[PDB]
Structure formats: C-alpha cells, structure tokens
Ligand binder design. Structure first.
Ligand SMILES: [Cl-]
Ligand SMILES: [Cl-]
Ligand SMILES: [Cl-]
Ligand SMILES: [Cl-]
Ligand SMILES: [Cl-]
Ligand SMILES: [Cl-]
Ligand SMILES: [Cl-]
Ligand SMILES: [Cl-]
Lengths: 451, 452, 452, 450
C-alpha cells in the first residue's frame, strides 16, 4: 500500500510497444513488471507480492535483496570495469580457483555469460580436443530426448524438447538422442541392475552403431529439470560415464540449473558419484544478480591446447564473458551459500517440501507423481493415475494462474514436449523457510481444488 | 613496495596459469597481463605498468574507464531489484527498449540478450519463424560476406567468413552462404563506379537468384567489416544490398555489435549509409562493456507476425540473464553520457584527426599499404610490397604490436581471421580520447614502425 | 593350349589389377575371382573352377543364371528401340509398370530408376515434395533402424544404420533419425509380447513425438534387415510401425530391394506382415540382375499431389537411364518366369527345408548361436559363447567363408556393416535351387564348420 | 500398324501407372516411342521426328545399331551377372579401353548413372584425404547454374535451384561460385585468365573457406544442361592450377560432354588439363544400356591399398559395371572410333553453328548462338541490348512448333529461375549435312512465330 501510487500506465504501454518477451503468447495485459524483492518474495509495480517458488528462472539461489552482493559488484565496478579474457583480471582468477575447489578439482575454467554459451563452448572444446589428439573424426554429440541445453542453433540441436526447436530448424547434423531415464514412466528401473536397464543399454548400443570413433561427447543434466524434473536410477550417471569412457568419448555434465546447491549438493553430479570431463554452469553462480557462466574442463583436456602450432589454441573470443563485477559478485555469492549452509538447507527443506506435498495433495485424483531432490520438485498432473495420461493443458494452466492470483509463483514445463507439458515445478530460493514452505503447499493445495 | 607487489603478482599469475582458460591465445602463462585498474583511456596492470588502450578493451569500452556514474547506476539497481525474467518485465528493460528505439530512429521492438553472438542467433531464429508464419517456411538461408565475423557459436560461425575462427569446430549447419566482401583498397575504383555495376554488388543479386529467392531468409552484414580488417565499402553499397534483399523478399540484418554507439561517428554504422534495416543487433558499447548486455531490434511489422493465438506462433526462446536489470540501468546512464558529452561527434572528429595524422606520420613508410577508417575506427594495412599489396609477414606485424605494448600502447591486429591476411593493425580508442592522447598513439606507433 | 590359356588368364588378371576398382574389398589382386560363365545356381571363373552361388550374385539373381529367354527378351527390344527418355514413354516401361502394380496389389504409380540406392533417393524426394504440396513443408525428417542399410549415396548412407558403410564419408545431411532394430535373437521373447508393449516399437512412437510429428516425412525399413544380418522382427512389428506412421501423419517406405521378387517366400517381404506401404522400392531381383533396373512404387493418393498447374508442382527429377527399354522387357520376362515356375512358393518351401536341415546339421555346433530365415534368405549367427551371444572373432568366420569357397560354395557374410558384429553368415541362393544342391550347401558348410 | 484403339489403351495404361520425370501432368501430351533408326525416332502413332537431342544428350552413335544389340545379346548368353567386388572380362576390357580413351593412367570404378558416378567421386575424394593425413578436407565446390545429378548430394553440388527446390535441406560443405559465361560476361575471353573475376573467385573462396577444408572442385568443361554456357579457353586450366595450389582435386564431370559430344573424346581435352577424377555416363553406351564410370588417377587409388580395417573403398553398387552394358560399351567405343564420329561431331558441329547464325542470327529475339562440336545453344532474349531472357511462353511455343513439324529440340527448362531461355541441340554424332539442313530449316520456320 504505497503512499504514492506508482504510474503504471505509461510503463505498461511502453513495455507493450517496445519490449519483446521471451517464451510467451502476446498478452500485454498479463505482463508482470517486477519492481522490488527481498528474500523469497518479489513485488510488482502495482504493489502485489508473490512467493517466488521458481527463484526467477531456477537461478536466484541465495534469495533476493542481498545487500552484500550489490556491494561486491559496486566495489569492483569502481576498481576495474572491464579487461579482456584473452588477458586476465583478479576477480576471474579468484573465481576460477574457487570454482575448482567447489568442483573438487582439477579443472580449468573458461568464462561465458549464459548457460547456452557455456554449452556451446564445451562442444567446440570437445571437437578441437579430439582433432588435436589424433581423432579428427569424432564430432558427434549425444543427449536425451526431453532435455534442454540452450537456445542457440547448436544447443537446440542437442535439445530434446521439440517445442523449443520447431520452426528454427534445420540444424547441423551430428546430434543424436536417446531415451531419457524417468523412474515414474518406467517403473522399477530403479530396482534393476543398472546395466540391464534398457535406456542405459541404449547409450552403449547407439555409440556402437554410430561408430565409437565418431562420438565426441555425451551431454546431460544429472536431473532433467526444465523437461519435467525427470529422475534417473541412482547408478545411471555412473553407467553413462563408464560407457563414454569405453567408447573414448567425453561426458559433459550440464549443471546450469542443478548447480550451486539446487539439488542438495554443490552440483547435481555429486549425487551420483561421477567426475565429469566437462561441467557447464550459469544461473545460480551469481544468483542471477549479474550475467556469468563457466565451462570447467578436466585438465588433461586443457593440456592438448598448449602446443606451438598455428591452430592449436582455443580460437574463441567472448567479449563480456567473465565480467569483473559478475565474478566479484559470484565470489561473494559462493561465500554466502557456504556460510549460511544453503546446500544442506536445500537438502533438508527439499525433503520437507516433498514429504509435505505428498501428505497434502498426494491423494488428489489428478496428481500422478511427486518427486524431487533438494529444492527442486516436480508434481506430475495426469487425467488418469493408471494410464498416466498427461492432464489437459487447460487444467494445469488454471492451477498455475490460481496460484499467482493468490501470491505464489509456481512453474510448469510448458513448451518442452508436445502433449507432455503436464508438470508443475518448484525451485524456490535456498533460503526458504519452513513457514514459507507451508505457504507454498497451502496455496497449491487450495489451487488444486479447482480441478 | 615493489617487492610485495612482485610477490602478489607472481601468486596471481600462478593461480591464473593453473585455473583460467584464455580465449584467443597461444598458451603463454608468463606473458599474461592481469588488469588491475583503469581511468579514461588508460589501463594499468597488477605490476603497475600503464597503457593507452587503443582498443577500448575489445572495441567496447566506448565511454572510457573509471566511470563512477556507471558504477552508481548498476549499484542503485542491484539494491532495488537484481533479477526478473524477461518473459515478464522490469522498468530498466522497458526504459532502455524505449531509449534504444529513439537512438535507432524507430520503430523497433527489442529482444534482450547478453552477448553479440546471442543477439545474432536471436535474429536468425526470428527471421526463420517470421517467414514460417508469413506463409514461407521454405525461407531458411542466411547470406553474409567472406572475411566477416558474426559470433563464436556454431550458427554465427557458420555465418562468419573468417576461417581461422571456424577451423576444427566444423561441421556446421547448411544454409549459410557467403559472397565477396567490398574492400575499396584491394578493389580500387569501386567507390567511383555506379554501385549496380560493382561486381560484388551484382554477386548478391545473382546468388539470391541462383539459390532461389524463395529460400533466402536474411542477409547479415556489418556496415564496416571491423574485426576482419576495417574493410570498407563504397558509399552506396549497403543501400544497394538492402534494395536487393527487398527485391528477393529477404531481410537485412545490420550487425552493429562493434559499429554501434558512436564508434563510426554516427550513433550506428548503418546511419552512414542511408538505410533502415529490418533487424539490428547490438552489444559491446551499449554498456561500454561495464556489464554484459546485448539487444536485437526488430521492425514493428516483423513483430506483428508473432501475436497470434496459435500454439507455436510466439517466440519460443528464453534467455535467462538477457536484459539484466543492473546492466540495463547502467546502459541507460551510458547512453546519457554519450549524448551529453557529444561523444558521437567527437568520434567523427577525433577519428578524422587520427586518420589524417597517421597518414602524415607513417604514410610514407614502405610497408604501410593503406590507412583507412571512419570515426574512431581505423585500420593500417601492412604489406611486403605496396604495388602487389602482398600482406606483410606475421612476425613483422606481431613485432610492431609487441613493441607498442612495451612502450605503453595497446594496439590491435586482425589475428586469426583470414589465413595469410593477418596483416592489419586496428585502432578503436575510447570515444573520450583527446588530441594529446592521439599524439601519443601515433608517436608510439611511428617509433615502433621503425623496427621494420 | 595348356600355357596359352594360362597366358590369357594371367593377362586378364593383370589388367584387372591395373585398371579396375573393386567395391567393398581390401586390395588383394591375387584373391580376385573373374567370372566367366554360369548356369542355374552354379558360376564358373576364368580358371574353370565352379561354385554353387549361395548368394545369387548379390541377393539378386533370383531366377538363376543362364536364362536364354531373358537374353532373348533384351535382344529383341534392343533391336526395336534402344532408348527413349522417361519424360516421355516406351511400351516396355508401360507394360512393366502395369505388371508391377499387379504384383504389388495396386494401386501404385511407378517411377523407374537404375539402382536400389536411386530408388530410395527418389522416395525421399517424393516424400518431401508431397508434404510441401500438401500444406506441410516442415516435414523433412526420415527415420530408420540402426544396423540397417538403404544405399551407397550420401542420403541413403545417412538413412543407413551400418557405420562401417558410412565412416569417413561423413558429414551427412541433418534430419535422419534412427531407432533400435527389432532382433528376436538378441531380444528374446519380443516375439511373444503384445506388440505395443515391445520397447523398440514404443521407441518409434516416442521418437516421433519427441521430434514433433509435424517434422517427420517418412519411416523407411526393410521387412527383414538382410545385409545387416538377417535380423528378424516380431510378426506384428511392421503393422505396428505403419499404424504409428499413420498416427503421426508420416509415410512408410518399404525397402524391398533385397526382399523383393520371391526372396522371402512372398512376392515381396511386406506381404508376410499384412501392411500396405505408402511407397515401395525395388531393384536387384526385378531383372534377376541381368540388366540394371529399379523402381519406386508410390500410392496413387500421393501421386495426385503432383498434378497441379503450378510452376514447381511436378516432380522435377530426371534419371537418364532409368526404365531402360531392354531392362524393362527383360524384367517382364523375368516376372513371367517367377510366376510360371512357381518360384515364390518354392522359395518358401525350400527355405523352410534349408532352415530346418541347417538346424539339424550344424545347430549343435558350439559356435552357432542362432539359425534363422524366411524363404531362401537365411542367417547363421556365429558366437564365441552361446550364453553371452558374443559375436565370434572375425578371423574365425572369415576362415569359414574362405573354406567354403575353396570347396566350391559361395556363402555370404555381413562384413563391414556393424563394428564388432560382422559375425553372421548369409545364404540367399537362386530361387530355382534344388533339394540336392541344398544338400551340397549344407554339407559343404558343415565340413567348413569343423575347422572352428 | 497399331490401330487407334490399341494406341489409346497403351496411352491410358501410361497415365494410370507411369510416373514421368521432369514434366507437368499432361497425359495426352505424352509421346510413346515405338522405334528408331539413325537420327530419327518414331512414336506409336507412326509420326517421325529428327531427334535433335540424342534422347537426353546420350544416343551418340545413333539409333538402330544392330551391332550394339548383338554385343549385349552375346554377353547375356555368356554371363549375365557377376559382382564388381569380384570381376568379369567385359568390365576389365572396358576399364582398359577407357584408360586409353582418357590418356591414362586411371583406375575405373563402375556405376550405373552419372549421378552415382559423381557421388562415388565425392566419397573417394573424402576417403582419400582421410587416409592422406587431411581428414578436415570435406568440402566440394561447383558453379551456380551447373548440374551434377538428381541425388541429395549431387543436388547439393548442383547450381540449378529449380532442380533443388522443395527437396531441401541438403548437407553442408557444398560451395558455389559464379559460372564463366562469355555471352553475359563479354570480353572475359580476351582478358588474361588470372585477371578474370570468376577465376579469381575460385582462388579467393578457397582461401576464405581455408584450403585445408576443401576436397574437390567439380565442373563440366561446358555447362551443358544449364544452357551451353561456355568459358574462356584457359579457364579450366586456371581452375586446375588453383585446385593444386590449395591441395584440392579437380573432378571433370564428363557425363554429357563425354564420348565425342564436343568434338574431342572428352570435353576437358579442349582445355589442356589432366583431371584428378573424371565421371562418365550417357554416351558411353550410347544409352542402349545403363552404365557409368568414375576414373580416378592412379596415385589416388594407391591410398586405398593398405591393410587397415577401413582403408579400402567400402562401397558396393549392385548393378554397376553390368556385363552386357560393358560389352555393348566396348562395341560402342569401337564404332565411334572406326566411323570417325569425334571428328564428325566437330565438323557437323561447326557447320550447324555457322548455318544457324546465317539462318536465324539476325532474328530480333536471338541473343546468341554458341556451341562446340554437336552441342549448341541458341539463347533467346526479349532484347538484344539488355540480354533479358525471353518470355517463357515464347520459347515454349518454339519447342512445341518444332516437335509438331518433326524436330525434337531441347530447352534448359527447370534449371535457373527466370533463365529458362536457351534452346539446346545435341544431335547424334552420325547426323548428316542434309539432316542439319532439316534441323535449321525447321527451327527457322518455327522462329517465324515469335
Ligand atoms: Cl574502470
Ligand atoms: Cl539431459
Ligand atoms: Cl533483488
Ligand atoms: Cl559482415
Ligand atoms: Cl531397415
Ligand atoms: Cl534403337
Ligand atoms: Cl548368366
Ligand atoms: Cl559445372
């Protein structure tokens, strides 16, 4: 209830006239213009407040209104605004060292701005690495259907969500896909000996059938998040890594969403006992206060780029990547996550959120499955629990809308896989409290009563 | 003390060698320069050496270093709202989009991205989807010039005409075509001819006809090919290319990543050439590179095609960080600075002075083939022979770049663009550069030229 | 003429080595066999050695060698009209098209090509143009099975799932997808499951969903994967795949290049499996390989889409030699032979006898993993271990192939199809083969098996 | 002979069952060939036509050759099939004979069609480099307005968009350059070849794409189907020298120009070059039976002789090198040689060219008349000054008028949009002076319409 009422009309009119909004139907009258935020709550220009159950876009991990983060950026901006990453600056050096600690070592870090750029960089490094190790023929990249890895032509090629690809094709050749592990739609795969699991055998078979010698890397999120919070058997990622190694290919762990405490570990891959050859990161690295991403590469791979030959080094320049202010802010963000025990709070609040959700709506006739790890949770809505038929779009959409009216931002896997945008997503900021979790669940439960 | 400074430097260099992967350079850990601080046109490393940055970082620190008002703008926004998804909106993005539309001359709708490469990728996707929704799904092809650069991603590398930026990252997608670049130095007299009799202008029309008009989505070009060597076209070239695009039903995308925001002596490069582009891409100088931000400006009529109620009719593209609140608020202040300090006109005037003085000072040098530029954007083409125009040996131009750096000038070079044509020195100093600093640039270069 | 004949053969072999490039083999001039003459199921080389041809040349001499009536048919036509372009027509092409339509069961329109690879290429182009003219230009994708083969050209190799036929000829075009091949030996009990619960059947539907139905033009498959290893599917597999194509709006192409013309005990392989394919491709046995000819049969509803007055509406494709008059006239006589000598039914009955006798004869051999087939089309899968099904060592299966040839039997092998899986012996004898010649085949193989 | 009722039935069967290449669905317009002799063909209704196109640039020795029929028949009675993984005597003898014809020293891979022959050349080029330490060389370069086949890869290499449209997308790695055309680029034939812009373009594009990524440049010596587009004399040699400079191969597409068509055994022989790879089809058998060949320099073949798993050419073409077609081809080459057909092509071709200029050269819509050997293009224009291609109906009416009057003349239809304006003649090499008079007389009268 602001003392002076903000002038919305001009701002709203200007947005509609000049701003192109990603991922949505033209509905200017539905635009939410964010004004301010604190903790887990955001507020629009009209003054309405919402619990942000999505951390913006899976990314505001340390929460909103962090004065410490603002100061870190401010101090750096006053010292040195820019230095090219062909050369170096102290914030980038300190962050690279810090990321190496977080990763468990030993990696060399190339800085980029976005998760899409980080994945593109991983592809180029993989190809040049093999060209310089006497295996020029290895160019192929393999991923899972229903996955996402970016918004560029090559990361869309690697993406398995056709609703993100359609009408932007044709793409380059050399991108292959396999069935995604999903313990809900493939019941009992979790029980099986991992190497008897069909979608695990598929990885090995396709690599054999494509010829090992042509495969550069397998890319995967530890959990398929955007796609629907699809989860694999415990030994899946390790089996995939052993398969890559068998065929001489690299494993790239896409940690763009799972990174920085999201799943209850520093990174998603750490749930699954693997050391990936390349790790890509963005989003939570700065809690999205400033743009920054990174591609961490095993050091043996970096060694291949040290020669005196004309084309032996990485011939790639990213103007803004590794921005000084973003790096300084990221260092402070990592210190916050560590000092406030946000990784373990994610694990614990995540369990509570999962346990409570099942208790509150699990019996609902259109709730097919509730699953998650850390503060990363999917509620799969179905027309029928027996057949697992995805719920009608109209029904899930009305639940997301109802929650917003009531002050809760909840996500949905819209525009990922046709006929399967049936999944509600929660990824709240890691600082979320037990009481705010009660608000989330209470709000959702009430919204569920409309279907 | 120096001894302490030496120790800190070593510790830092050691950490860098161990942990940091540097773009665009041979692995030379000892040679690395760690930036420490900066003010105006000068940067300083951790050991305390100062350099005139004749490159504005990477063609991008247009308003100069040390801008406290830019730091304040970002800080004030970070304290108000640090993040909001661009699927939704926030005031800094809205105000910047409106401001950019003024700068562009209207009427455009702006999609925000982090980098120039992302901005170009966005342009490609918008061009393809626009045609798909206008009844022409078959239009997928993108056309650009050899010796051009448009980004570091698979698709922007496919559109790129610098093979040294592409080699060993192929194969790329099909549907990317290239034509001869206009270069008034290596194609003497093209500037004089009627534009439509110019062979590389006829090439654009011919190739569109021979590929079938109906398959061409867009032609992408920088108004000046900058990274490639500051290659410059006849005055009427860009307008003839636009008219040719329109004839074939294709869009023209002006890549303003480097030429934007006063660099050429106009707000944008295309404004030198009397054309209104369908799409404009921007990055770099938009924030003077203090924070990452880029934009893809699209004509209103193209945007209208994405307003339908159909399932796939909207732009199904999400960029997490693009349009960052702090970067937008900082960009707004940056544009205010450029306007209030008359930096666009200073670029034009200091640019002329730099060009005229360079010619007087080193024009007669036997290995200087050509000096050209527009605004604070200048290339000095070095040759073994002025008659044949044979590019100078790599060692010779490299020694000049290194000699300047020792003498405290950072000058650029078109390294790793086109094989055997790495022979062009580049200057793009910050638009605040003074007459006296220009004298330092030229004096230092002149002295470094004496070693070859 | 003891040394005169030797001089002649030596000379011929020397000229082969210097001038002839052979398909699909390591350079082995001594190894080369020069065919001289043939009759029935037996071929004879220039040195005078005779062999039972257990492979019908290359799966193709279905009616057997030495057919004077086929020679006469070609000769009579060469004397009447040697050539006429298929943009226009000739009577042999018209009569053959009509006869192929009967054999197919109607109602199809036939486009003539020389090879199976060309026939499949033609099918791809027709599928794409069909959808472009049906208001779905976005449909470009082609789907097939890993371990499958569809030709030796860039696009048919892209559709091919045998990497040893592809390696070092890449990169290929995008838009070619592959799924797991049904193989009732390595996936035991899929033949007794409900077809829609079979994982590699569900895979077809899932991948079409995940790629977006609207982008899929066609699924291409042989009814039995022949060159690959005689891999066989559950009875209802092909019908399920067709229903899945129809569900997604895509076409089904039956690759009948090897299975066609009696090979499997039906006129065509798809007829074992109760489907009416949208497109059928044929070559090989159509002329018993006496002359080159192939065909792409397309459903009439599909051909209707190419009858418009629009500029690009017709099939803009010309194949100079395809539908050669002599080859068509010979093919007609060949079809008449197959029908009059009841070669289809004979293939089915002789094929059963061959399969059962092989099981009785070498079934218990410790390295014989599986014996399977349908009609005169049989695979013997050799393994190091019957429990693990590990493919046998290459040197071991190679020695069996060589031992057989030395004793006058040509037996095939799935060499250079799938790495690590080159372990399957293949028999496809001419459909005229007799009980007694089958005894010779099996007896010779049994004796060759002894040595491993 | 065949009563109207029976011909109607045959025509009806064609409509129902036969899919024709390269034409609008016009069942009534279909010509069903019945028989032929020399340069004349006859349809089922009994009408006769001078075939000014040799079928499709291919019936080089003429129709009605009993000796060719006998050669095929004799072989079909001896051995009808043997796999080219192995060998037969007709293939061996032909390979040797083709090597003589080419000038040596080449190794021959047999295919059926020109499209397959070109595909084979692409695969060999790529594997050759992969085995020579340059796996990065995968690109193929060709000219816009050129044609190399009807398959996805040969269409990618093709520069005629009307043969490509709606069959796309194609694979990446196919590049195109401006075609030399001495009519639309006047005075390039007088320039020093290396100052010619479309010659410089080859060198520049190879540099700009990076030499190390280029596998081969493919080109017809004369762009025939595209509209008989002809280059300066030193163009092909300059292109070869440029390929060599960049470490790339030159493939001469001789599918149409081969076997006497241009007045030499092969087109490249007009231009003083020895190509790395030569592809052939059409006239090799005079189109009596299907056969094509890919001739590869000996030194390229040497790279495929190793003991490594993947070192040999892993390519099988079932029908390629058919015994009857090879035996017939051998007799066809003996005929061309014995009857002095290559020389006749040059002589009759010169005659045809000069008489045409005299008869129709002054026609206001005839922009240019050009050719070499029995390969001639007459470019029709709305205006001789601007060279604007003639209206489409106008050239179509001339083609139709000629057929009505018993002459089959060709046209470059469905090649380059807006540029379908060139009439083509490629008559059988045995054509006589008197038949040439008939051709020209018939065309002259047809031109009267427009
Ligand atoms: Cl600064
Ligand atoms: Cl994934
Ligand atoms: Cl905030
Ligand atoms: Cl450009
Ligand atoms: Cl198959
Ligand atoms: Cl004839
Ligand atoms: Cl025979
Ligand atoms: Cl050509």
């Amino acid at each position: 209830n602001a003392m002076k009422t903000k002038q919305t009309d001009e701002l709203l009119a200007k947005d509609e006239q000049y701003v192109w909004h990603g991922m949505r139907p033209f509905s200017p009258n539905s635009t939410t213009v964010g004004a301010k935020a604190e903790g887990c709550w955001v507020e629009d220009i009209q003054g309405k407040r919402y619990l942000d159950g999505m951390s913006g876009l899976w990314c505001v991990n340390s929460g909103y209104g962090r004065k410490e983060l603002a100061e870190a950026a401010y101090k750096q901006l006053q010292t040195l605004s820019y230095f090219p990453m062909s050369q170096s600056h102290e914030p980038a050096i300190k962050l690279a060292e810090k990321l190496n600690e977080w990763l468990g070592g030993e990696y060399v870090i190339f800085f980029s701005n976005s998760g899409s750029e980080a994945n593109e960089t991983a592809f180029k490094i993989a190809r040049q690495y093999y060209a310089q190790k006497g295996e020029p023929h290895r160019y192929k990249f393999m991923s899972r259907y229903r996955g996402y890895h970016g918004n560029t032509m090559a990361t869309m090629a690697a993406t398995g969500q056709a609703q993100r690809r359609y009408q932007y094709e044709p793409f380059a050749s050399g991108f292959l896909h396999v069935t995604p592990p999903d313990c809900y739609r493939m019941p009992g795969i979790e029980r099986e000996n991992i190497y008897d699991v069909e979608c695990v055998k598929e990885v090995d078979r396709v690599m054999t059938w494509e010829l090992s010698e042509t495969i550069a890397a397998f890319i995967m999120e530890p959990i398929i998040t955007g796609g629907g919070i699809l989860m694999a058997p415990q030994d899946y990622m390790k089996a995939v890594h052993e398969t890559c190694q068998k065929h001489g290919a690299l494993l790239i762990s896409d940690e763009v969403i799972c990174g920085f405490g999201r799943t209850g570990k520093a990174f998603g891959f750490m749930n699954y006992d693997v050391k990936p050859d390349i790790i890509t990161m963005a989003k939570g690295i700065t809690s999205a206060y400033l743009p920054l991403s990174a591609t961490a590469v095993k050091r043996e791979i970096y060694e291949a780029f040290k020669g005196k030959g004309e084309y032996e080094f990485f011939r790639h320049i990213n103007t803004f990547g590794g921005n000084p202010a973003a790096c300084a802010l990221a260092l402070k963000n990592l210190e916050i996550i560590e000092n406030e025990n946000l990784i373990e709070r994610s694990a614990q609040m995540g369990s509570l959120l999962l346990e409570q959700l099942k208790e509150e709506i699990g019996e609902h006739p259109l709730v097919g499955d509730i699953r998650g790890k850390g503060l990363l949770v999917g509620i799969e809505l179905v027309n029928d629990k027996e057949t697992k038929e995805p719920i009608d779009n109209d029904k899930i959409a009305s639940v997301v809308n109802a929650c917003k009216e009531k002050g809760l931002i909840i996500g949905r896997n819209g525009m990922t896989t046709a006929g399967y945008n049936n999944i509600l997503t929660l990824a709240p900021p890691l600082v979320i409290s037990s009481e705010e979790i009660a608000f989330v669940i209470g709000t959702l439960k009430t919204a569920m009563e409309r279907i």
